[PDB]
């Protein structure tokens, strides 16, 4: 038999009462279960069209069978029963978009969950738009300062790039993203209008309490006013977690297509992959490696490929993506991690060994790369970071001769220099000066355990009285010869004073 060969539909046909019910635009649920609802009717429904149930839940018409329609429910299937009336909305599944969502904590479908009122959106954008082609894109040029010394120095992230934050549990993957969100405040407050970065954070499957605490952290740092929090937590149904990344991706595409720059944080894309695997298995589709569907790579590719940098012909906007992949026991060579690595333009490994030893952030500078990051790096930061990277690589190579002893000492000093606190992103010029201090051999004399104290004092000293030099560095974008001499003099003076 078939789904619509049920006795009730047959009775409706033979009795001739198939005229009163509107089968063209509405439908009745034949069988709700396993998260997929079969609907009889909706003859004029479209593929991927969003349909709303009687209870209030909305669903996406995935399978258009000859006799029925397979609708995935964006919510708990308990509220859906057999015989419920399903009606079309006449639109492919979309999400409210615009600047009215800035500062709003929304769910996968754009509904506000912060209790601050309805979203005042005026335009809706489809969640499954194709990524821009070859022509509309241009190479990544503008930098995207994260505020992390290790990131902005050794693994620079461009504006429009896709950089993966990959690591194990409790390795600071979320902390890097949060600091990046906070770091943009300096650019957003100013009137540059080309360095503003409207951040977006998407929570996929993580705890509701964690998302609430993240929102509290952003509000306390006055960073909520330019960020959008799309929440699809663990309690939310699997379709919501599957759809959540695409909703935030569309929200960022709005900024991308209007000449503005946006940042999207796909936190826990692995949890989205797990949710999609659940959806596929409940649909009885052939599983593959690790019981995953065969199209998980497409699932992540059609999402991350939308993040790109547009040329001046298409407004010159951009959309930077920082997906987060959770790895088990640091297994980089796993299905989902390797799929995401094959998509992103880099990775930031956060080894649990370094995190345990106290190296926070736990970036594995040996294995962390950024393919298109060198072009999108400021000249002064590049000048210091090239030498820093060379010295760190040489330190890693050797880790009793005088030369190798000096190399090991310099490497230890630089490693202690890269250590940074939480929720305190640094300005680009401040990082340039700090790295300049270590690179030019002004820390070889100090004991390694005193380097952090030295930096804490040196930041305060420079940011207070020597503001002119930092402003000159920020305006120029490079460390000039006069700038080099002045910075050398002041760092030597402070080193003498520090004692």
């Amino acid at each position: 038999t078939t789904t619509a060969e049920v006795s009730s539909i047959l009775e409706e046909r033979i009795l001739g009462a198939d005229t009163s019910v509107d089968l063209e635009e509405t439908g009745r649920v034949l069988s709700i279960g396993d998260g997929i609802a079969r609907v009889h009717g909706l003859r004029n429904v479209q593929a991927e069209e969003m349909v709303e149930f009687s209870s209030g839940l909305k669903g996406m018409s995935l399978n258009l069978e000859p006799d029925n329609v397979g609708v995935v429910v964006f919510g708990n299937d308990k509220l859906i029963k057999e015989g419920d009336i399903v009606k079309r909305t006449g639109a492919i599944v979309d999400v409210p978009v615009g600047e009215e969502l800035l500062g709003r904590v929304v769910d996968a479908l754009g509904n506000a969950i912060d209790g601050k009122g309805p979203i005042g959106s005026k335009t809706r954008r489809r969640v499954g738009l194709k990524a821009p082609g070859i022509i509309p894109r241009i190479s990544v040029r503008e930098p995207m300062q994260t505020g992390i010394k290790a990131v902005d120095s050794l693994v620079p992230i461009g504006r429009g790039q896709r950089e993966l934050i990959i690591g194990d549990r409790q390795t600071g993957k979320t902390s890097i993203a949060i600091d990046t969100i906070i770091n943009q405040k300096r650019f957003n407050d100013g009137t540059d209008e080309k360095k503003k970065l409207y951040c977006i954070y998407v929570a996929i499957g993580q705890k509701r309490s964690t998302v609430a605490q993240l929102v509290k952290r952003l509000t306390d740092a006055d960073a909520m006013k330019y960020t959008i929090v799309v929440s699809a937590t663990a309690s939310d149904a699997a379709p919501l977690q599957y759809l959540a990344p695409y909703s935030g991706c569309s929200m960022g595409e709005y900024f991308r297509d209007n000449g503005k720059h946006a940042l999207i944080i796909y936190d826990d894309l692995s949890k989205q992959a797990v949710a999609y695997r659940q959806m596929s298995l409940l649909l009885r589709r052939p599983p593959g490696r690790e019981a995953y569907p065969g199209d998980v790579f497409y699932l992540h590719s059609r999402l991350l490929e939308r993040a790109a940098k547009m040329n001046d012909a298409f407004g010159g906007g951009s959309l930077t993506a920082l997906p987060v992949i959770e790895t088990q026991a640091g297994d980089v060579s796993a299905y989902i991690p390797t799929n995401v690595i094959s998509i992103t333009d880099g990775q930031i490994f956060l080894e649990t060994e370094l995190f345990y030893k106290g190296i926070r952030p736990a970036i594995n500078v040996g294995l962390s790369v950024s393919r298109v990051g060198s072009a999108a790096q400021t000249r002064a930061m590049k000048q210091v970071a090239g030498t820093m990277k060379l010295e760190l690589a040489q330190y890693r190579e050797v880790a009793l001769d005088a030369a190798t002893q000096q190399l090991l000492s310099r490497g230890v000093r630089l490693t202690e220099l890269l250590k940074q606190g939480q929720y305190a992103p640094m300005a680009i010029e401040e990082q340039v000066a700090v790295i300049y201090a270590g690179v030019r051999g002004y820390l070889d004399k100090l004991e390694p355990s005193k380097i952090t104290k030295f930096e804490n004092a040196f930041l305060s000293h420079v940011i207070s009285q020597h503001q002119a030099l930092l402003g000159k560095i920020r305006a120029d974008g490079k460390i000039s010869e006069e700038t080099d001499a002045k910075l050398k003099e002041i760092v030597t003076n402070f080193l003498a004073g520090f004692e």
Binding site: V211, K216, S235, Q278, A291, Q328
Partner: protein
């Protein structure tokens, strides 16, 4: 009222005429001596709903009438559920008469909304020095209690219940998922002896929810939700800092996998249900800190094949906020409680949450213990005279610390005759800070064994010689 059309295994299909019950609705089978509750899981079509059974399906005849209760499985809840044992369907199984309460609550409830969630991490002071110092329990968090028998896990559970009842004035719920009947009876009588549950007056502090291993997988899949509903009543209608216990979460995952397999759903990796993450989330997200109160869950964990990367332990760790491991080696060393000071970790062990002083003290204690491990290795290999004076003083301080972590328990007073101590967090921090500062280096090693506040340690030192 429907009729049974399929009795395949524990999966029973009921066909209704007038009104199809929604999913997760309780169906009561007629004509049976003992209540048989069926939970609707699917709508198969043709006015037929596929249900899983909460009891044996023998004696079911195609055509038996089943009544739709109109709501999910509703359990008796209230202050009168304390000191009682109830199964998944809420029936009392302690043979002490019906549990007479005022209101019932459905086990299947939505997680608290985003606004209801608290936005500030807060430490739940358990009164235990080792726990409150090195692996503090976040209020509304989840704790993974590692270790099995021979390490006093049940004693620790009873002492946690007693401490939370005495300090925060909050009751506790023990939901045994797949718990052995013999071990269930032993725990019941041990709790009776400890006084955490009283059979005479209404001073009991634990509400027991037992799903035994001989029950169908559907029963063990919802026993955790039953206990969680019992805790939710206290959190919401009374605003207490409830303490939920799940022994253990792995059997909850196994019951979920069995239930999914019975419904003919293609399994995920390592033979787990496709809805493993979603079911675990729906269970755990109700364990949070609302504005009225909070629920803190101390869930025992069994790691299958000793593989922390298996889907069940990984999904469980995804929700954990702290871990307490009871090492048999520590118990053999004579330190009770047997919480391992090194392997136990807490996510809230951060200066921004517990304060700079607490974080510094805990980090110093852990560093001294690790240095003691290294020096003990050296002493095992070389001689004790090889190490310097600094190494000897660090060894002495670390021994004093690891004997100070031991603490008498009120629940064990009747056995060992030693009065139990509820050490406040401030006293614990101050004592360990003073020990690290070398203030009490002249006191003997046994001066800190099985004492509460450091004042009792100096008193015991005075008692010695």
């Amino acid at each position: 009222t429907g009729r049974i059309v399929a009795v395949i295994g524990a999966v029973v299909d009921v066909q209704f005429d007038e009104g199809l019950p929604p999913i997760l609705n309780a169906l009561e089978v007629q004509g049976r001596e003992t209540r048989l509750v069926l939970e609707v899981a699917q709508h198969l079509g043709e006015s037929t709903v596929r249900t899983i059974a909460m009891d044996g399906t023998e004696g079911l005849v195609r055509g038996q009438k089943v009544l739709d209760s109109g709501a999910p499985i509703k359990i008796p809840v209230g202050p009168e559920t304390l000191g009682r044992i109830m199964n998944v369907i809420g029936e009392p199984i302690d043979e002490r008469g019906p549990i007479k309460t005022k209101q019932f609550a459905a086990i299947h409830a939505e997680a608290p909304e985003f606004m209801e969630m608290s936005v500030e991490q807060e430490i739940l002071v358990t009164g235990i020095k080792v726990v409150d110092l090195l692996a503090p329990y976040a209020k509304g968090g989840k704790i993974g209690l590692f270790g099995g028998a021979g390490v006093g896990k049940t004693v620790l559970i009873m002492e946690l219940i007693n401490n939370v009842a005495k300090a925060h004035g909050g009751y506790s719920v023990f939901a045994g998922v797949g718990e052995r009947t013999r071990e269930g009876n032993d725990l019941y009588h041990e709790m009776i002896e400890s006084g955490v549950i009283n059979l005479k007056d209404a001073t009991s502090k634990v509400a027991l929810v037992y799903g035994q291993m001989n029950e169908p997988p559907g029963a063990r899949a919802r026993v955790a939700l039953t206990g969680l509903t019992v805790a939710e009543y206290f959190r919401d209608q009374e605003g207490q800092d409830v303490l939920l216990f799940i022994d253990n979460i792995f059997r909850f995952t196994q019951a979920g996998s069995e239930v999914s397999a019975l419904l003919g759903r293609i399994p995920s990796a390592v033979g787990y249900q496709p809805t493993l993450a979603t079911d675990m989330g729906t269970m755990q997200e109700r364990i949070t800190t609302t504005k009225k109160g909070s629920i803190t869950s101390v869930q025992a964990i069994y790691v299958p094949a000793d593989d922390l990367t298996d889907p069940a332990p990984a999904t469980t760790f995804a929700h954990l906020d702290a871990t307490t491991v009871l090492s048999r080696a520590i118990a053999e060393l004579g330190i009770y409680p047997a919480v391992d000071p090194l392997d136990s970790t807490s996510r809230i062990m951060d200066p921004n949450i517990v304060g700079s002083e607490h974080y510094d003290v805990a980090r110093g204690v852990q560093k001294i213990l690790q240095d003691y491990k290294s020096l003990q290795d050296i002493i095992a290999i070389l001689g004790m005279d090889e190490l310097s004076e600094e190494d000897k003083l660090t060894v002495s301080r670390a021994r004093k610390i690891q004997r100070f972590l031991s603490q008498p328990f009120q629940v064990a007073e009747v056995f060992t005759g030693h009065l139990g101590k509820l050490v406040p967090l401030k006293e614990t921090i101050k004592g360990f800070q003073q020990i690290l500062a070398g203030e009490y280096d002249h006191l003997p090693e046994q001066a800190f064994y099985m004492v509460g506040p450091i004042e009792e340690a100096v008193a015991k030192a005075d008692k010695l010689a």
